[PDB]
Amino acid sequence: AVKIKLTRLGKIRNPQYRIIVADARTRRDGRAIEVIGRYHPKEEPSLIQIDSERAQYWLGVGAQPTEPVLALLKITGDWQKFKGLPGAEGTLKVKEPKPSKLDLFNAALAEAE
Amino acid sequence: ARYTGPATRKSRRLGVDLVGGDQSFEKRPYPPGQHGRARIKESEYRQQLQEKQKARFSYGVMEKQFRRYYEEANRQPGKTGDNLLRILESRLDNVVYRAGLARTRRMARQLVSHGHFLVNGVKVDIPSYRVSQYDIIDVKEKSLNTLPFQIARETAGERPIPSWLQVVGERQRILVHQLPERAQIDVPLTEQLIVELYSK
Amino acid sequence: ANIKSQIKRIRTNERRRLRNQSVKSSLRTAIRGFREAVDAGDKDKASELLHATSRKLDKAASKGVIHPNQAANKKSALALALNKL
Amino acid sequence: QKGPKYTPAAEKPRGRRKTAIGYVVSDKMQKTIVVELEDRKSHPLYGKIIRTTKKVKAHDENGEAGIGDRVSLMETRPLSATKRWRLVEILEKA
RNA sequence: UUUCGGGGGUACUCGAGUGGCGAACGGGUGAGUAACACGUGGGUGAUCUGCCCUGCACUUUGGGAUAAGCCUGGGAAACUGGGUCUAAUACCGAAUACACCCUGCUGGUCGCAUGGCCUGGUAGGGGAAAGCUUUUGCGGUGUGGGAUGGGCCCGCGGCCUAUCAGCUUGUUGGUGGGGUGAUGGCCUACCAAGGCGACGACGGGUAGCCGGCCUGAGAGGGUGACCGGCCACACUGGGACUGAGAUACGGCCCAGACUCCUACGGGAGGCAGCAGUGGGGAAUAUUGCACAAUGGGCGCAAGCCUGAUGCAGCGACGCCGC
Ligand SMILES: [Mg+2]
Ligand SMILES: [Mg+2]
Ligand SMILES: [Mg+2]
Ligand SMILES: [Mg+2]
Ligand SMILES: [Mg+2]
Ligand SMILES: [Mg+2]
Ligand SMILES: [Mg+2]
Ligand SMILES: [Mg+2]
Ligand SMILES: [Mg+2]
Ligand SMILES: [Mg+2]
Ligand SMILES: [Mg+2]
Ligand SMILES: [Mg+2]
Ligand SMILES: [Mg+2]
Ligand SMILES: [Mg+2]
Ligand SMILES: [Mg+2]
Ligand SMILES: [Mg+2]
Ligand SMILES: [Mg+2]
Ligand SMILES: [Mg+2]
Ligand SMILES: [Mg+2]
Ligand SMILES: [Mg+2]
Ligand SMILES: [Mg+2]
Ligand SMILES: [Mg+2]
Ligand SMILES: [Mg+2]
Ligand SMILES: [Mg+2]
Ligand SMILES: [Mg+2]
Ligand SMILES: [Mg+2]
Ligand SMILES: [Mg+2]
Ligand SMILES: [Mg+2]
Ligand SMILES: [Mg+2]
Ligand SMILES: [Mg+2]
Ligand SMILES: [Mg+2]
Ligand SMILES: [Mg+2]
Ligand SMILES: [Mg+2]
Ligand SMILES: [Mg+2]
Ligand SMILES: [Mg+2]
Ligand SMILES: [Mg+2]
Ligand SMILES: [Mg+2]
Ligand SMILES: [Mg+2]
Ligand SMILES: [Mg+2]
Ligand SMILES: [Mg+2]
Ligand SMILES: [Mg+2]
Ligand SMILES: [Mg+2]
Ligand SMILES: [Mg+2]
Ligand SMILES: [Mg+2]
Ligand SMILES: [Mg+2]
Ligand SMILES: [Mg+2]
Ligand SMILES: [Mg+2]
Ligand SMILES: [Mg+2]
Ligand SMILES: [Mg+2]
Ligand SMILES: [Mg+2]
Ligand SMILES: [Mg+2]
- B113 CB below 7 A from strand E atoms: yes
How many structural domains does chain D have? 1
Taking the C-alpha atoms of residue C51 and residue C45, their distance in angstroms, rounded to an integer, is 10
Write the CATH number for D44.
2.40.50.140
User: How remote is the CA of residue A67 from the centroid of ligand 6, in Å?
Assistant: 30
Same domain flag for B57 and B124: no
Taking the C-alpha atoms of residue B134 and residue B177, their distance in angstroms, rounded to an integer, is 5
Task: For residue D50, give its domain range.
Answer: 2-94
Chain B residue nearest residue A108, CA to CA: B136
Q: Which residue is nearest to nucleotide E91 (CA to C1')?
A: C19
Q: How many CA atoms lie within 13 A of C42 on its CB side?
A: 13
Which of chain E's bases lie under 7 Å from a protein CB?
A: 17-23, 25-27, 42-46, 48, 50-57, 91-93, 99, 101-104, 110, 112-114, 119, 125-128, 142-149, 153-158, 172-174, 177-186, 194-197, 199, 220, 227-230, 241-244, 248, 250-252, 269-270, 293-297, 308-312, 320-322
Same domain flag for B196 and B118: no
Same domain flag for B105 and B168: yes
CA of B6 to C1' of E175 (A): 105
Please, which experimental method was used?
cryo-EM
Of A98, A99, A80, A102, the C-alpha closest to A89 is A80
Ligand number with the minimum distance to the CA of C80: 29
The CA-CA-CA angle for residues B80, B86, B91, to 5°, reads 130
Same domain flag for B98 and B79: no
Q: How many cross-chain Cβ pairs, A to B, lie less than 8 Å apart? A: 11
Same domain flag for B43 and B124: no
> What are the angstrom distances between the C-alpha of B95 and each of A15, B17, B189, C27, D12?
36, 21, 19, 95, 70
On whether any CB of chain B is under 8 Å from the CB of A106, the answer is no
Q: Residue A35: which H helix or E strand, with range? A: strand A34-39
- C35 CB below 7 A from strand E atoms: no
Task: For residue A2, give its domain range.
Answer: 1-95
Same domain flag for B60 and B117: no
Write the CATH number for B20.
1.10.1050.10
Q: Which amino acid, residue D50?
A: I
Which parts of chain D are beta strand (E)?
A: 19-26, 34-42, 49-57, 69-80, 83-92
On whether any CB of chain A is under 8 Å from the CB of B134, the answer is yes
Q: Which amino acid, residue C15?
A: R
Which nucleotide comes closest to C19 if you measure CA to C1'? E91
CA of C6 to C1' of E275 (A): 26
Chain D neighbors (3+ CB pairs < 8 Å): none
Q: Where are the domains of chain C?
A: 1-85
Position A103 in a domain: no
Question: Resolution (in Å) of the shown entry?
Answer: 3.1
CATH 1.20.58.110 fits C1-85, yes or no: yes
- A19 CB below 7 A from strand E atoms: no
In order, the DSSP letters of chain B are: ----S-HHHHHHHHTS-SSS--HHHHH--S-SSTTTTS-----HHHHHHHHHHHHHHHHT--HHHHHHHHHHHHHSSS-HHHHHHHHHHTBHHHHHHHTTS-S-HHHHHHHHHHT--EETTEE---TT-B--SSEEEE--HHHHHSHHHHHHHTT--SSPP-SS--B-STT--EEE-SPPPHHHH--SS-HHHHHHHHH-
- C25 CB below 7 A from strand E atoms: no
Taking the C-alpha atoms of residue D83 and residue D56, their distance in angstroms, rounded to an integer, is 7
CB < 7 Å to strand E — which of 51-110 in chain A?
Answer: 60-62, 64, 66-69
User: How remote is the CA of residue C12 from the centroid of ligand 18, in Å?
Assistant: 20
Same domain flag for B128 and B173: yes
Do the chains contact at B168 and A105, CB–CB below 8 Å? no
> What are the angstrom distances between the C-alpha of B52 and each of A46, B156, B189, C14, D27?
49, 30, 9, 84, 83
Cα A80 to the chain's mean position, in Å?
16
3-state secondary structure of C45: helix
Of A74, A65, A3, the C-alpha closest to A33 is A3
User: How remote is the CA of residue C14 from the centroid of ligand 39, in Å?
Assistant: 28
CA of A30 to C1' of E292 (A): 25
Taking the C-alpha atoms of residue B33 and residue D12, their distance in angstroms, rounded to an integer, is 91
Taking the C-alpha atoms of residue D77 and residue D15, their distance in angstroms, rounded to an integer, is 13
Q: In this structure, are residues D76 and D66 in contact, taking their beta carbons and an 8 Å threshold?
A: no
CB < 7 Å to strand E — which of 66-85 in chain D?
Answer: 74-84
Which nucleotide comes closest to A24 if you measure CA to C1'? E296
> C10: phi > 0 → left, psi -120 to 50 → alpha, else beta; which?
alpha
Quote the radius of gyration of chain A (alpha carbons, Å). 19
User: How remote is the CA of residue A35 from the centroid of ligand 37, in Å?
Assistant: 22
Q: What is the dihedral of CA B38, B41, B42, B44, to 10 degrees?
A: -110
Paired sense of beta strands D83-92 and B118-119, if any: unpaired
Task: For residue B46, give its domain range.
Answer: 1-91+186-200
